[PDB]
Ligand binder design. Structure first.
Ligand SMILES: [Cl-]
Ligand SMILES: [Cl-]
Ligand SMILES: [K+]
Ligand SMILES: [Mg+2]
Ligand SMILES: [Mg+2]
Ligand SMILES: [Mg+2]
Ligand SMILES: [Mg+2]
Ligand SMILES: [Mg+2]
Ligand SMILES: [Mg+2]
Ligand SMILES: [Mg+2]
Ligand SMILES: [Mg+2]
Ligand SMILES: [Mg+2]
Ligand code: NA
Ligand code: NA
Ligand code: NA
Ligand code: NA
Ligand code: NA
Ligand code: NA
Ligand code: NA
Ligand code: NA
Ligand code: NA
Ligand code: NA
Ligand code: NA
Ligand code: NA
Ligand SMILES: [Sr+2]
Ligand SMILES: [Sr+2]
Ligand SMILES: [Sr+2]
Ligand SMILES: [Sr+2]
Ligand SMILES: [Sr+2]
Lengths: 46, 119, 81, 194, 65
RNA sequence: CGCACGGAGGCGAAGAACCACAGAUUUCCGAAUGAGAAUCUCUAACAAUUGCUUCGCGCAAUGAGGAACCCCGAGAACUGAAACAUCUCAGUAUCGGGAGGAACAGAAAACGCAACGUGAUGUCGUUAGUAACCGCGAGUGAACGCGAUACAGCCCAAAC
RNA sequence: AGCUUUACUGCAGGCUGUCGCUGAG
């Protein structure tokens, strides 16, 4: 497929959102990324 | 057009309008179709003018037959704005009536006679 | 109003381009053209830009590979920041 | 004495006789070649227009609209229907043709508001009405003691909400007594049984 | 912190611009040091630099430049 | 120094945080309006429809949204009638158009406890499941009046 | 429920008369 510049920005964001909850947030909140998406098991929009 | 039953020669129309101008400066004249209509009905009309480019024609259709059953003579003017200018208006006039001329009664009288002849 | 240059893109690959090809790499606003990247860079660091290559990254930003003239030295320009 | 206007009025009591008859037979030929909504500089029926609120002033507009004659242009049912609801031919719309005309006019002039309208005849297949519209934003009207009322916000799109004269009659609001049990204050408040 | 509002209102229209360009540069050089993972940072300034720029711009708007 | 109790660091007596009011900034798509486009792009823009008009987009209007309410149009069927067609469900569901903070109505070509009487209009209570409708089946179903609430009455067309 | 027909009742559509558009001798 051929991605447009906008589609690319969106894919980019989805990839970023796919990171984990930083180590410190765990301590700070004294104790999950409910949006962990796998490329294979999941499906993005568009 | 539906109310026009005879054509008035340019020259005749020229005389008529000129007579109207000396009528506003000397005697008295009525401007507007409503004021003109009341002249004919009140009898204070000597000569009534009717433009031929009136649209809708309803505004003037009645003048002719009304005048006939009132002895009042009438003449047609080709353009609406010329009659209004002669009457002394900045706007046009679908109809005007010379309510008692003045130092024009001689000419007016002729115009009337020139029309009756023109049928 | 948005600025053209965001920040220096400093990665191993960026360094090689700096040492071996006299090129500087930047994260720049994705609305900026090669020409705008060229100017902004000359004005911010006072150097002569010979060529600019751009790329719309999978990070949502635009990367610009800017080659300087032989008159300037990338390593030096980069070293002062 | 009789006003000149009374003569226009009297002519239109019988649009099929006298000079008026000949006029219409002539005009309609041109009208049939005009569009759906034609703005005209002067009302064809001056007495009627003035009588309805018209004024030779800035912000006052007049447009003639033609609408097809006859019943509803209805499509036959495409699913199950009891006999009572299978009709097509004899069904007529609940809005009269004059009201349809007022609406088509108002759509053409989105910024204007319908003040009133009247009939100017018909031929075998269509009817013509002239609609009077007012520019609620023109200061010549905002300062008019007889028309500035139409500038209020609640008078917006009045034609589409049946606030027009033809609207109120067509809604059965003419009578104040017997017969208007389900029309006043509105058809909707009365369960739509008017 | 270091740059107060009075000080900004006392500057001339041309001094705020010069000051603006100065601040923008400290900011750019900080983000550069940050990009290089450089830790000689002091997190408060990069955050303060942004507000200072916002203040100067606000005043430039207020003063008509 | 948000939710959020980390680390580093910073801000605050130049009175910060925080709250109220007012103002500044306010990317792109979006009624979306220069043109095109799955939020981008291409070469000055009220696109489109209108009013006024210095007839020049010069001055203006419309567009879309909103929980439901409100007004104007289009308008079923299951169902009930122990079947079913009129009837009923119901002018309901749903659809089209449109306004406001509320809408709509409204100063009698009224009422008609018929009177030597009432006196704009909504609405509430009642009149009453009365009158009226109806395979006179099933079902459907007001009004005048009265007691209340709140009260307010005017402007044109024409004559001259 | 789908289907059929000289089942019951209706609805489109076609044919035809009439009125309007529609006038002169
Ligand atoms: Cl309207
Ligand atoms: Cl009573
Ligand atoms: K049924
Ligand atoms: Mg990664
Ligand atoms: Mg490329
Ligand atoms: Mg109501
Ligand atoms: Mg666009
Ligand atoms: Mg049943
Ligand atoms: Mg039975
Ligand atoms: Mg019912
Ligand atoms: Mg009653
Ligand atoms: Mg069956
Ligand atoms: Na996938
Ligand atoms: Na970056
Ligand atoms: Na309109
Ligand atoms: Na009814
Ligand atoms: Na804002
Ligand atoms: Na606009
Ligand atoms: Na213009
Ligand atoms: Na049953
Ligand atoms: Na059955
Ligand atoms: Na029945
Ligand atoms: Na009583
Ligand atoms: Na079946
Ligand atoms: Sr799969
Ligand atoms: Sr004129
Ligand atoms: Sr990355
Ligand atoms: Sr509207
Ligand atoms: Sr009262």
């Amino acid at each position: 497929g051929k991605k447009s510049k906008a589609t690319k920005k969106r894919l980019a964001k989805l990839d970023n959102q796919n990171s984990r909850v930083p180590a410190w947030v765990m301590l700070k909140t004294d104790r999950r990324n409910h949006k962990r998406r796998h490329w294979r098991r999941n499906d993005t929009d568009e | 057009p539906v109310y026009v039953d005879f054509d008035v020669p340019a020259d005749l129309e020229d005389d008529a309008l000129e007579a109207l101008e000396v009528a506003r400066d000397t005697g008295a004249v009525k401007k507007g179709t409503n004021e003109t209509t009341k002249s004919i009905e009140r009898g204070s009309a000597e000569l009534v003018f009717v433009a031929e480019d009136v649209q809708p024609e309803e505004i003037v259709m009645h003048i002719p037959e009304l005048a006939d059953e009132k002895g009042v003579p009438f003449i047609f003017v080709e353009q609406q704005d010329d009659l209004g200018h002669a009457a002394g208006l900045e706007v046009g006039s679908a109809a005007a009536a010379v309510t008692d001329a003045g130092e024009a009664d001689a000419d007016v009288e002729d115009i009337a006679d020139k029309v009756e002849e023109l049928r | 109003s948005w600025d053209v240059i965001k920040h220096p893109h400093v990665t191993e690959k960026a360094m090689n381009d700096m040492d071996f090809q006299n090129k500087l790499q930047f994260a720049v606003d994705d609305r900026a053209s090669k020409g705008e990247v060229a100017d902004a860079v000359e004005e911010q660091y006072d150097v002569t830009v010979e060529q600019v290559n751009t790329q719309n990254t999978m990070d949502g930003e635009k990367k610009a590979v800017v080659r300087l003239s032989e008159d300037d030295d990338a390593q030096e320009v980069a070293s002062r920041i | 004495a009789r006003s000149a206007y009374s003569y226009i009025r009297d002519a239109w009591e019988n649009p099929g006789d006298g000079q008026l008859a000949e006029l219409q037979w002539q005009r309609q030929q041109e009208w049939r070649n005009e569009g759906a909504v034609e703005r005209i500089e002067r009302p064809t029926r001056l007495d009627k227009a003035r009588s309805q609120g018209y004024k030779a002033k800035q912000g006052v507009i007049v447009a003639r609209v033609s609408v097809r004659k006859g019943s509803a242009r209805k499509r036959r049912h495409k699913a199950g229907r009891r006999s009572k609801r299978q009709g097509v031919t004899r069904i007529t719309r609940r809005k009269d043709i004059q009201r349809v005309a007022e609406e088509r006019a108002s759509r053409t002039f989105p910024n204007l508001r319908v003040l009133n309208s009247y009939s100017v005849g018909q031929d075998g297949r269509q009817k013509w009405h002239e609609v009077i519209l007012i520019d609620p934003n023109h200061p010549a009207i905002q300062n008019d003691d007889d028309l500035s009322w139409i500038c209020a916000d609640d008078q917006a799109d009045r034609v589409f909400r049946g606030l027009t004269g033809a609207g109120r009659r067509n809604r059965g609001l003419s009578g104040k007594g017997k017969g208007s049990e389900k029309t006043r204050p509105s058809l909707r408040s009365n369960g739509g049984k008017g | 912190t270091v740059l107060h509002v009075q000080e900004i209102r006392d500057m001339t229209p041309a001094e705020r611009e010069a000051e603006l360009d100065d601040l923008k540069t400290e900011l750019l050089n900080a983000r550069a040091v940050q990009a290089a993972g450089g830790a000689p940072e002091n997190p408060g300034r990069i955050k303060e630099l942004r507000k200072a720029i916002a203040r100067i711009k606000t005043i430039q708007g207020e003063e008509g430049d």
